[PDB]
Design a protein around this nucleic acid. Structure first.
Ligand SMILES: [Mg+2]
Ligand SMILES: [Mg+2]
Ligand SMILES: [Mg+2]
Ligand SMILES: [Mg+2]
Ligand SMILES: [Mg+2]
Ligand SMILES: [Mg+2]
Ligand SMILES: [Mg+2]
Ligand SMILES: [Mg+2]
Ligand SMILES: [Mg+2]
Ligand SMILES: [Mg+2]
Ligand SMILES: [Mg+2]
Ligand SMILES: [Mg+2]
Ligand SMILES: [Mg+2]
Ligand SMILES: [Mg+2]
Ligand SMILES: [Mg+2]
Ligand SMILES: [Mg+2]
Ligand SMILES: [Mg+2]
Ligand SMILES: [Mg+2]
Ligand SMILES: [Mg+2]
Ligand SMILES: [Mg+2]
Ligand SMILES: [Mg+2]
Lengths: 80, 55, 67, 143, 60, 206, 145, 141, 63, 70
RNA sequence: UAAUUGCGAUAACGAACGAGACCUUAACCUACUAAAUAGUGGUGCUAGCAUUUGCUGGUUAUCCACUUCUUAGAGGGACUAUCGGUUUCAAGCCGAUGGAAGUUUGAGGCAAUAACAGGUCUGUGAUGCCCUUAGACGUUCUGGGCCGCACGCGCGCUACACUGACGGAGCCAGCGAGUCUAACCUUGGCCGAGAGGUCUUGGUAAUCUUGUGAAACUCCGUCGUGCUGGGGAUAGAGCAUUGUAAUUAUUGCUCUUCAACGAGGAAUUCCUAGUAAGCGCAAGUCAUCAGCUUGCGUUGAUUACGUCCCUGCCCUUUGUACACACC
């Protein structure tokens, strides 16, 4: 009784970093292509009124050597 | 045991001191391979279908 | 080295371009002008600006200045 | 004009009070004096041998006059100097808690300092008196 | 100001970079004289997530 | 000098000289003139100081180092060789002592003698290590007044410190000594030698 | 202090405790060239023997010197602490000693052997010409023996 | 109340608080006369304000200073500044302006930053050396 | 010894591979109306006074 | 060890007749006149000051200084 | 120009990421809101010295008042300003004055695209595949080892003394940290030469330890150039502390023992102002142990304010049969 929990939907997930990581995770885990999964996530984020958004995917798919990919659209400052 | 240790000649400084020093002491870093860092030894290689599936 | 970035000099340009009557050879009041007339997010950048638009001003008095 | 001890410089005062405490003969000087070292951060005993208790006491006196209250721990720390840890870097170290606490008791039995509330030792009302006196003596030689 | 100074590196390699995190603790107290009513009113409300409020009593 | 006193009183000779002349420890800043052209403008004397200790921003600009009183420039360069790094207080007194010594011998404003020994150990020219092709010869060069002072303060103090090393005579005595000999250079002094031998090899390659 | 005078009275160098002592040195430190008597020990003994430390080893009336030797080889009788002493709680008769001169040499031997003779690792370690107080023997002390 | 001001001086971390009331001319620091102070070699550094502007000036006023923090020199350079800042604080409100500006003139002419506190301050050291500019020591290999 | 005084009239720049060396034109005081360029060893500004140890001889470049 | 630790009557006599013309006297200066080690050196400085000859124009530790009387 | 920072030239015009802006810390506010957990003046209550009023203290509330100092909120301030030199009279640079401040104000934090088979599976209940899995490569328990010593390399510490060692005496910081379901930081009083012990005590802390009375340093003595009273390695004997445990000696104290080292070859590191160097502190680690580190303040210089000679890296140009890119 001295501790209380409440849930709470979140005003657009499209502007939550965490929301979209877990989306990607679920996308690639659900056996989705890669560029599909990324560009999809980016284009929903942008569509959700973002100023800019960037998705890196690192590690290894199918080939034995690791690679990485940048997926980005719009605007981002990086400093200060 | 401890009786052996003091009784044992061929022990203690006086002895070592009077022995030549190996040259393996004054050695180098040995290094061994680095000029072969970028050349994969796996023998294997990937392929352009597999990288194109995954990525 | 105290070379003024473009955002400084670009603002200075635009400001002189459209508020020459108003502004003077005096930074102190050119400062205060910037408040009422320009939106800037930092004291530093604003004095940084008016400081130079005051410099620019001061030598338009003795001949034109390209830009 | 009137006088304090604050109107008298550091060394002149103490060296006059030291000569005073000596002159008098009323003191109490533990007995391990001469054979003792002042601090574990030291090398040699005092060179005043027959004396230096009068040095410390008069010093101890002046300090406790200059302020509300102090203890042994404080005087230990005050009188502490550096101790060459031989080949290792110097560290400040506290001085003997015995030399002081007995310099305290001695000066107290002679009534130049009392126990104090709050804690520690306080300058005796009779101390003020007899301190400001010899202090005045010191500027009397400078007249 | 709570300082914590740690090597960025999980391991050992590299020039020895050091990095100092800090957490800033702000503490205020305001003394009031009031009856019981206002106090209990003024403490229950004025509630704010993030600020630790603490009300003692007495002159000792 | 019209004496004056209030509550906590101010000592006679203190009350005295101070308000009158603005002189050193107790030495005359008047007179004291640089017996060599140039080197003025690069040797202070006036404005006059009480002791050679100052929180002086003499670094932040290229030449303002020159404006530092030459006596305190002298002391400044006493404090070094690691163990004595910093320790201006130590030095300041050594100079007080030094000047007192210098004064005793042959009189003169001992501050003026310092002025003399300086002006007397600065090499009017020197040499650098010009390439010219591997086996480098030595191009002669006429050295700046500032460097001429700098080298003097450095040269003087050093060979006095070296003299003062490992023997009974104090820093103050050797310093005073090295100066006196160098005031009118007597070539018994470490610095004059180094000066003359610098101008010897400067001349020997022109 | 005072300009003194004296006549032929003081002789330079003088031998006591089976060693030799330079006269023209302040007597406290003079006594130190005897094995087993550091500046402290020296200081106390003469403080006990009632001697003007301001003196050298030079003056020192013959009588004064004798008493100095006396106190040195009986420290517990002439009221010198015991913690002041190079060898308290012997290890045989248990008495507290202060061992002097050619004797401190003897007693380093005696302990060292007492260890060796008992096969104590500390001893073994001595007999091997090593460092015994457990310092690292990799990098330090290489010149040595 | 009698006429008075409070001022300060600061060198490094030393801060020298002063009280310049109107009185029979005392000049004491912490609790002792200014003819003590010691350091001593530097003693004349804190006489200095008195001398530059004539000993007299202090007869209609009393002077106290108490220095906390700083160090055995930091405190001498602080107290003098407070003393002279103090003297020129007094002629600001009690004597006339011209008097004051004559005082400030013969201070800043000579000066050792008697009116103005010194900007200088320790730099933070950085990781990789025992100093702020000093780096440790490397050997390559 | 014939002393020779010359006042720096212009600072020309740094020769010497190292570059501790400054090219300077000077006006000697005892009878002006002539000039000669010298090479300095120390830091130098305008209106300084150099003691030319031999009046007539000048250099140019340095390596 | 190399002489100058005692008083040798003739030495005392040396000190009295040999300290004029010394525009400078001090601890060191006394050692330099082929005599007196630093210890008895300071004693002499106090005891030439007993009466006459030397005037104390400088103060303390390490550095002493005197001049001929007038 | 520190900067693809700008000016300018101009088939380019005008913009974005990064640099700058921004943020944090240190510097300035007798302007603003305040404070018995910060302090000042006055007043009482009170001690000492003088006495002619004075001088120097005591008194977590006996009261009044204030906010200069301390603290931290909100604002203000600086923009290389005024002027003059200099320059394509352009961006700029330089000097003087003024100023808390005029070197990106000093110092940091942040930091684009790209690269490396750099390091890290030994930080992780992050992880693939391999290996192992009961006589275990799981795990725990007892004991040793990581410290082992002919010797090579690297970071350091203390020194070779007289700008010093020693002995008294002066006596001054800043950043920190501290105990609940507990034994942390420790004042004070005693006992002890010392290390320590013992009786109490304040503090979950601007409130108590702590003004952290820190060290260099300052002053008056002692020593007197002698491997000396510099130096303190090595070693013996005793006493204590932490801990279940101290032997291979945890640390601390005392006596004694008293080495090498007389400024260091070829070489090589670090550094431009409150910096170098010297000096000590707190914090991390931590039952106990700092010769380490991260920060801190204290004393406080000499010398540049330049260049491409050395070394290192950028940029064009140019060659290429390289593109997994000279491994
Ligand atoms: Mg940006
Ligand atoms: Mg930035
Ligand atoms: Mg002390
Ligand atoms: Mg101390
Ligand atoms: Mg040292
Ligand atoms: Mg001995
Ligand atoms: Mg070792
Ligand atoms: Mg305020
Ligand atoms: Mg100015
Ligand atoms: Mg690899
Ligand atoms: Mg890992
Ligand atoms: Mg290991
Ligand atoms: Mg390293
Ligand atoms: Mg000392
Ligand atoms: Mg006992
Ligand atoms: Mg409690
Ligand atoms: Mg020796
Ligand atoms: Mg020693
Ligand atoms: Mg620790
Ligand atoms: Mg470590
Ligand atoms: Mg091509």
């Amino acid at each position: 009784g001295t501790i209380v929990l409440y849930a709470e939907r979140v005003q657009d997930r499209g502007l939550s970093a965490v929301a979209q990581a877990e989306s990607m995770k679920f996308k690639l885990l659900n056996g989705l292509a890669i560029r599909r999964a990324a560009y999809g996530v980016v284009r929903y984020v942008m569509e959700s009124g973002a100023k800019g958004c960037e998705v890196v995917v690192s590690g290894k798919l199918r080939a034995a050597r690791a690679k990485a990919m940048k997926f980005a659209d719009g605007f981002l400052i990086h400093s200060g | 045991g401890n009786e052996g240790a003091i009784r044992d000649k061929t022990a203690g400084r006086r002895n070592n001191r009077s022995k030549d020093v190996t040259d393996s002491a004054t050695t180098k870093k040995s290094n061994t391979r680095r000029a072969t860092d970028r050349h994969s030894r796996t023998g294997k290689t990937d392929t352009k279908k597999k990288v194109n599936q995954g990525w | 080295g105290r070379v003024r970035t473009k955002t400084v000099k670009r603002a200075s340009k635009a400001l002189i371009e459209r508020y020459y009557p108003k502004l003077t050879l005096d930074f102190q009041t050119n400062k205060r002008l910037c408040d009422e007339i320009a939106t800037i997010q930092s004291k530093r950048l604003r004095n940084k600006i008016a400081g130079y638009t005051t410099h620019l001003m001061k030598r338009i008095q003795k001949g034109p200045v390209r830009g | 004009p009137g006088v304090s001890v604050r109107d008298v410089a550091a060394q002149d005062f103490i060296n006059a009070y030291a000569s005073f405490l000596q002159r008098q003969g009323k003191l109490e000087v533990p007995g391990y004096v001469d054979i003792v070292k002042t601090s574990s951060g030291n090398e040699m005993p005092p060179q005043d041998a027959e004396g230096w208790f009068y040095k410390r006491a008069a010093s101890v006196a002046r300090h406790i006059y200059m302020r509300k209250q102090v203890g042994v721990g404080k005087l230990n720390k005050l009188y502490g100097g550096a101790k060459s840890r031989g080949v290792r870097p110097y560290k400040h170290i506290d001085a003997s808690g015995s030399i002081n606490r007995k310099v305290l008791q001695a000066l107290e039995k002679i009534g130049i300092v009392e126990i104090s509330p709050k804690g520690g030792r306080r300058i005796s009302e009779n101390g003020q008196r007899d301190l400001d006196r010899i202090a005045a003596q010191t500027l009397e030689e400078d007249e | 100001v709570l300082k914590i100074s740690t090597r960025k590196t999980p391991n050992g390699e590299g020039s020895k970079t050091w990095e100092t995190y800090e957490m800033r603790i702000h503490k205020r107290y305001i003394d009031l004289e009031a009856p019981v009513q206002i106090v209990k009113r003024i403490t229950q409300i004025t509630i704010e997530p993030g600020v630790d409020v603490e009300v003692v009593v007495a002159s000792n | 000098f019209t004496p004056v006193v209030l509550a906590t009183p101010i000592p006679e000779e203190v009350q005295q000289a101070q308000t009158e002349i603005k002189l050193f420890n107790k030495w005359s800043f008047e007179e004291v003139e640089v017996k060599d052209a140039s080197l003025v403008d690069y040797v202070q004397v006036r404005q006059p100081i009480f002791v050679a200790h100052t929180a002086g921003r003499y670094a932040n600009k290229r030449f303002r180092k020159a404006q530092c009183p030459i006596i305190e420039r002298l002391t400044n360069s006493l404090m070094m060789n690691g163990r004595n790094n910093g320790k201006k207080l130590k030095a300041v007194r050594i100079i007080k002592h030094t000047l007192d010594i210098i004064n005793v011998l042959t009189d003169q404003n001992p501050i003026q003698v310092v002025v003399d020994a300086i002006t007397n150990t600065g090499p009017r020219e020197d040499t650098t290590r010009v390439g010219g092709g591997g086996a480098a010869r030595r191009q002669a060069v006429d050295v700046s007044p500032l460097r001429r002072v700098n080298q003097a303060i450095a040269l003087l103090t050093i060979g006095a410190r070296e003299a003062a090393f490992r023997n009974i005579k104090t820093i103050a005595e050797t310093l005073a000594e090295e100066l006196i000999n160098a005031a009118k250079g007597s070539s018994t002094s470490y610095a004059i030698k180094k000066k003359d031998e610098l101008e010897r090899v400067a001349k020997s390659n022109r | 202090s005072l300009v003194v005078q004296e006549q032929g009275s003081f002789q330079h160098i003088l031998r006591l405790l089976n060693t030799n002592v330079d006269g023209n040195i302040k007597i406290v430190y003079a006594l130190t060239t005897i094995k087993g008597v550091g500046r402290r020990y020296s200081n106390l003994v003469c403080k006990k023997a009632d001697v003007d430390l301001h003196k050298r080893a030079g003056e020192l009336t013959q009588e004064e010197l004798e008493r100095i030797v006396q106190i040195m080889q009986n420290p517990t009788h002439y009221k010198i602490p015991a913690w002041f002493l190079n060898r308290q709680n012997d290890i045989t008769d248990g008495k507290d000693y202060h061992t002097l001169a050619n004797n401190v040499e003897s007693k380093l031997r005696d302990d060292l052997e007492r260890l060796k003779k008992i096969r104590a690792h500390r001893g073994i370690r001595h007999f091997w010409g090593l460092r015994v107080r457990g310092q690292h023997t990799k990098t330090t002390g290489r010149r040595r023996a | 109340a009698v006429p008075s001001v409070q001022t300060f001086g600061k060198k490094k971390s030393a801060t020298a608080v002063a009280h310049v009331k109107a009185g029979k001319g005392l000049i004491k620091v912490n609790g002792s006369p200014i003819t003590l102070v010691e350091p001593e070699i530097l003693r004349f550094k804190v006489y200095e304000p008195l001398l530059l502007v004539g000993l007299d000036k202090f007869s209609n006023i009393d002077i106290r200073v108490r220095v906390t923090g700083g160090g055995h020199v930091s405190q001498v350079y602080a107290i003098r500044q407070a003393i002279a800042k103090g003297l020129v604080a007094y002629h600001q409100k009690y004597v006339d302006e011209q008097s004051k500006n004559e005082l400030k003139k013969a201070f800043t002419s000579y000066d050792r930053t008697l009116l103005i506190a010194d900007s200088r301050r320790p730099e933070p050291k950085k990781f990789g050396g025992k100093g702020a500019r000093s780096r440790f020591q490397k050997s390559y290999r | 010894t014939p002393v020779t005084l010359a006042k720096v009239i212009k600072v020309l720049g740094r020769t010497g591979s190292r570059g501790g060396v400054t090219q300077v034109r000077v006006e000697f005081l005892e009878d002006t109306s002539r000039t000669i360029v010298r090479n300095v060893k120390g830091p130098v500004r305008e209106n300084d006074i150099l003691v030319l140890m031999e009046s007539e001889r000048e250099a140019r470049r340095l390596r | 060890a190399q002489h100058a630790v005692i008083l040798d009557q003739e030495k005392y006599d040396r000190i009295l007749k040999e300290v004029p013309t010394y525009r400078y006297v001090s601890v060191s200066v006394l050692v330099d006149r082929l005599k007196i080690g630093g210890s008895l050196a300071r004693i002499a400085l106090r005891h030439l000051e007993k009466e006459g000859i030397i005037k104390p124009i400088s103060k303390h530790s390490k550095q002493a200084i005197y001049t001929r009387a007038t």
